[PDB]
Specification:
This is part of a larger assembly, with 3 copies of chain A. The first copy, chain A, is built from 5 helices and no strands. At the A-C interface, helix 1 and helix 5 of A face helix 2 of C. It is classed as hydrolase. Keywords: Human mitochondrial AAA+ protease, motor protein, hydrolase. The entry is titled "Human Mitochondrial Lon Y394F Mutant ADP Bound".
């Protein structure tokens, strides 16, 4: 289990911060699991002594297939796997954003159809 | 003259509303 | 986002000008840190978008 890290453990957590913030955004846009795990597992409480496993949970919280997760697990370099997890997160971000945008497009268009019927009666 | 409150990574900025939560019940009796 | 040690060191400074200057310097350092992280994330996101847009086209096709 490779667990290499920089002795300058000051600016590295920012990435994890980003990731958790990113992960937060996930649950904000894509409800998958209870936000309670975020509540108890707070990165600012100094309770995450194995941040590699926090990154693993974040990757698991993504919808990445088994192939992408295997590729990530094959990344021993902590920064590289973290950036790959960021890439998967961004992929799912765009996927869900397009899904919600298209659903909203459909619903507004149906509402416009109903309003067009209303206004066709008003035209009559 | 009160026992020191276990911060447990709960920074309290000045003039800032913050939340203190400690699993320990020994603080509940003091409260 | 200055760490607790930064806050304690700021509180250590007594004179109002000195503590205010330390707060300004901490603000500058936090701004630099945010800028650096945003630049790194921007480069990584650009490299992700370095993926041909046909990747997004196949996403749409699926």
């Amino acid at each position: 289990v490779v667990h290499e890290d920089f002795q300058v453990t000051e600016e590295v957590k920012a990435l994890t911060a980003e990731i958790v913030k990113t992960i937060r955004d996930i649950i904000a846009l894509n409800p998958l699991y209870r936000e309670s795990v975020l509540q108890m597992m707070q990165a600012g409480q100094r309770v995450v002594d194995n941040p590699i496993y926090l990154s693993d949970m974040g990757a698991a919280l993504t919808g990445a297939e088994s192939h992408e997760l295997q590729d990530v697990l094959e990344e021993t370099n902590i920064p590289k796997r973290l950036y790959k997890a960021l890439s998967l997160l961004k992929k799912e971000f765009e996927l869900s954003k397009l899904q919600q945008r298209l659903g909203r497009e459909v619903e507004e268009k149906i509402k416009q159809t109903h309003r067009k019927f209303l206004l066709q009666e008003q035209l009559k | 003259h009160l026992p020191l409150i276990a911060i447990t990574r709960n920074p309290v900025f000045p003039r800032f509303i913050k939340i203190i939560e400690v699993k320990n019940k020994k603080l509940v009796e003091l409260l």
